[PDB]
Sequence to fold (805 residues):
Amino acid sequence: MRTINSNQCVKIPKDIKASVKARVVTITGTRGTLKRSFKHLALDMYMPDKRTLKVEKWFGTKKELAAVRTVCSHIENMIKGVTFGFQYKMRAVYAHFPINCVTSENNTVIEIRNFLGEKYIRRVEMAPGVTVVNSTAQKDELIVEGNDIESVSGSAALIQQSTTVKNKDIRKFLDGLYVSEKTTVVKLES
Amino acid sequence: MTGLTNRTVVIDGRGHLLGRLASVVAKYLLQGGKVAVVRCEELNLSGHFYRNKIKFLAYLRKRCNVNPARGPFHFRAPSRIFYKAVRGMIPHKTKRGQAALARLRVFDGIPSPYDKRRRVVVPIAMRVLTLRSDRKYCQVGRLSHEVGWHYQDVIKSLERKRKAKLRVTLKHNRELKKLTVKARENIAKAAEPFNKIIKSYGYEV
Amino acid sequence: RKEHGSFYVGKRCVYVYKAETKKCVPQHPERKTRVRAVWGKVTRIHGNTGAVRARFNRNLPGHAMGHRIRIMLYPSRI
Amino acid sequence: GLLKEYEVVGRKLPSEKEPQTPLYKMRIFAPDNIVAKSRFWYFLRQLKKFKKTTGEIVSIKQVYETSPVKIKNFGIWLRYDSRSGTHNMYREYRDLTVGGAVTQCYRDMGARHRARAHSIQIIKVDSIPAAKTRRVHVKQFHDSKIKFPLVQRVHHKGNRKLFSFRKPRTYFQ
Amino acid sequence: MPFERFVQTGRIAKASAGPLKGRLVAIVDVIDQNRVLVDGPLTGVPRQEYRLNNLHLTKYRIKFPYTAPTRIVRKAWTESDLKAQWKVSPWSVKAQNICKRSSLNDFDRFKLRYAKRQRNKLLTIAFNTLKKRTKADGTPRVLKKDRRERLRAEKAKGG
RNA sequence: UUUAUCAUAAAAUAUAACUUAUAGUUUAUGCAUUUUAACACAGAAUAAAUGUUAUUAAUUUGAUAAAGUGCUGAUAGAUUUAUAUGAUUACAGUGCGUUAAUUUUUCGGAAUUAUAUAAUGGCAUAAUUAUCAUUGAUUUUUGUGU
RNA sequence: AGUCGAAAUCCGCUAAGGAGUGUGUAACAACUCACCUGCCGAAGCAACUAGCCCUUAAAAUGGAUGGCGCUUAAGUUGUAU
RNA sequence: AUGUCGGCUCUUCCUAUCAUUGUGAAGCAAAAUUCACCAAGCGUUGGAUUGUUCACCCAUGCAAGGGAACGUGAGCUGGGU
RNA sequence: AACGCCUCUAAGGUCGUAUCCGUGCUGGACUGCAAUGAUAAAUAAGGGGCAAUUUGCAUUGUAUGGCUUCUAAACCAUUUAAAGUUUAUAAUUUACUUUAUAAACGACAAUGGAUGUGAUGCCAAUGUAAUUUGUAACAUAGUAAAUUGGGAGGAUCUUCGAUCACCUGAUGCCGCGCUAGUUACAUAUAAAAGCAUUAUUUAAUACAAUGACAAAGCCUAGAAUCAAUUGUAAACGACUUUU
Fold:
């Protein structure tokens, strides 16, 4: 139909000094600065000469002007990433063998074994800006760190895939490494 | 210098597609060309990174069944994958179809005086002039690597050498171009030099 | 464009191409005779961008497809 | 053509058993002033007895749309026939004149439906004022005023020099 | 929003493609995704159909009602003093190459072009006038300081 | 159509007060002012735009045929022993032998009728053939005057 | 016993509570539905019809819109000159 | 006058996949096995009677799938025909 | 997310196969390509370079009427069809880096070229052509050149990469020849009736390419190939070697 016009201007908190060099959203804050690139995702935005930030898609069909809330969703996470960060938790549930999940620094990726008391050390490296530390004061729980929401879950997904059962009915052996909570590191308690 | 139209035409290839450049430069090349096409590493193709791979894996599958140093001579450097569109268009089984492929050089890595002689633009060839938005497109210098050109980085060890060497040269001419208008303050009172051109070009001259 | 080329109606068309010997004295205005050239005359605009077909005295010698032939102004008007 | 408009009246030649036949009228948009003369028979052969040649075609009249400078929009009712799903149909297209409002309507109906011209009968043309257009791709243009920086060009591509020198840089802001 | 070229009523425009190639016309209303009813009352063309593609836009939005007759546009265009401020636009000084560099007559073109010799005849003598820190003085400038005595002092000769 | 007038409509938005909100703002959370591209059909005035009717300016659009309308530029091509067994002729154009003035240039030119028609239309009437129709109009034969 | 399945069968209660919706619940139950109102305040939803893509759809020598190729086309459609 | 059937030797390509790599399904606990998508890379045999393709055995196999120019007689063999 | 919710896609970042591509291994534009070595007999006489040359005759090519020249110095430095860019100011920075503000520009007439984008040539003629012209006055401006050592520099199938452009030690003194604007002067040259002329369109100049001839100095002092071998090779040839 080539529908005409749809926009979005999210409210911007007073602490940050964010900008766009025409396609690249940067936003600085408490934990530092996180800038991810959209030189190719086909959208049009500019901060309307204020703290706030407005976006526009002129003359899109329907896949095309879907994008307006998405970049908006892709940056409202980036609000929380720079002033709070991100943290997930792995619960590490087993049936018989206690899983051995160790971390260190820095060298803060993972070091695991004993699945199922086996020989192969599974090992998963991480993304930059991301650290993975076991939870203290809690049995076999994990803490993710970082600011990129599309890297903390993927680092959690990289320890979701490994490890797994082979060849067997997974409805019998439900062992695995699972995410329980979706949390930030500062907001609002911690 | 001179040639039949000029001594040469040298075409930059950023966004200058494979198809609507060849199909122009082929037709030109039966009319007095003497051309060459350079910076080939960022031409463009429709489809995408994995799709128009599979355009280039039909014709890489095509051996010649019996003595396969008999037929198809594929070419892996991304220069002569330009050329694969300029061989169909010139009927190379005449001794005139081959009277343009001794005019035509095709380069990738911009050396060899097609780096100081001035390059040009051809309009319809531009990716920014015939391809709309959200229709993805593959890239030749990062496709033909993954159909096996062994020097996708061996350009960049020297491409950044020249791209660093071109920094200071524009700074060599930065203040020197600025010296001209600095010297032009000493020339506006020559005798009465300027009214002949303020009446002629004279808008910003 | 086809408004350009119609100014090339009715001009001659002439093309030189080199050869070996002289075989002719200089009498009509001086010629040591190294250059040899057949002749002709353009007529009409043909292509919707400016390609304009052209007839010669004899026939355009066949190996010239990519030789630098000329068009002189004769005859012309305003 | 540009689909000019003709009104047309038939005769049913004046045979003595009942002279003064009732002279029915159509409204024919047509590519030509020569072709509605044998399109009127195609509309007339749906209702009355009346076959050429037992009737004449008294004056076709070209009528000259009245309000071209204004931008009044119209709806058209429609009868398309696709592969076998012949139907009723209602659309609209926002055009300047009525005669431009049927060329465009053909060359949308042939554009998305394939709907050749031998299966379209323009059964009604109404000048819709406002507020009854369903038509989501139209009535978003009702909203005067509009900012609308849909900066286009012809994209004349590009122009003369087929080896230019100056990098054609569209956006130019 | 970077303050884009807003095709909005009633901004004046300079078309390029169709029969307005040389006309200054202004928008009445948008029609569809491609069509615009455009008009300039002071230039010699009424309203008619026109594509959104055939024209470029200026930057001077002038207020009208969206169902305005031409006569108040005839009123307001003179009121909005465009005809004053048109030919002062710094790159509509560049518009004067269709208003002066058209047809570029061959009864002055020597004086239009042997003066570029005259400008260049004093150009290069102001070249090799380096400031590049040499200074001073790069012998054999001892046999050039007498030449360079005719640049600075000046009186009288070198030296 | 358009433009210019007409009287009203009925006012849907655009010039044309000041709110509130919105952020950036000053002074001590609110105000002082700034962008309102939030702009409260938020106010009147105004366009009496829009709505109604009618007339229109060089009476205004452009299509589709008709007249040498008037050229300006070109393309390639030019039969012919017409007695080598039969107009080289006739159409027209030129310079010589009435006229009178009007007019213009004044150096030519220039311009003037009546001289005779079947007149052939314009108009008028007589007259009829004939006609979808017939207030009639198309005509036909004509006849006469002008 | 409201409840695998029900002949039946109303109502009382009440804005809204039905011999009842419930995890192959064997009793009571536990228990949330339906429903009404809070909450938000401009469009939503049911099947229907039919353009292209889409699944369909598998051949033995390696190669076919005729090749080069194209993708707000050089593409499938109605068409202007 | 196109030397016409088998086996031997021997390059090859083929997916409608037997089993090996990567999954998913299940009345998939495991072991075992079945389904189904992607996948042609190496692999698919040693023997009794027959002249054989098949047929049917015996055994290896943690396991033995189909097919192509009637592939092939100036390479044979000639057991049938 | 459009589809307030969800949702492995609507565009986007990733985990993955004996498959397919590449190293890895074997032949290599049959004779493509790269640097690199030698470079002759004789040294009486020659041969071969150095030569692109100093020196004429003679020929081609190219701007053909002096120029239908050019010039081989730029437009990001990952990347974009609304997207933006370019210059300012200030912070920052190695970096027109990053940041902030200001406009400027509005896919306008322009630009798709004379920004001729180290700002072209279309020339010093101060009679400027198929030759050169010269002498003064006036003003302002005032360039191009050539001899002596140490250093930073420059390669991607190279129009000279065993040298090369830049700075400096420093030799020296062109002050040989500069150009512009105004005015005067001394001339020489220049006319192919061809007057509806061109035509197999000269060609000089100049440029380079040349080669030849006697002219011009310099530099130069070998290999291959079989035969005969041998035996790491072998149908022969080739291939590894030897005196």
Summary: The two ends of chain B are 27 Å apart (CA to CA). Strands of chain B lie at 10-11, 36-37, 44-45, 105-106, 138-139. The longest strand of chain B covers residues 10-11. Residues 17-20, 22-23, 26, 45-47, 58-59, 61-66, 71-72, 84-90, 130-133, 135, 137 of chain B lie near RNA strand G (CB under 10 Å from a C1').
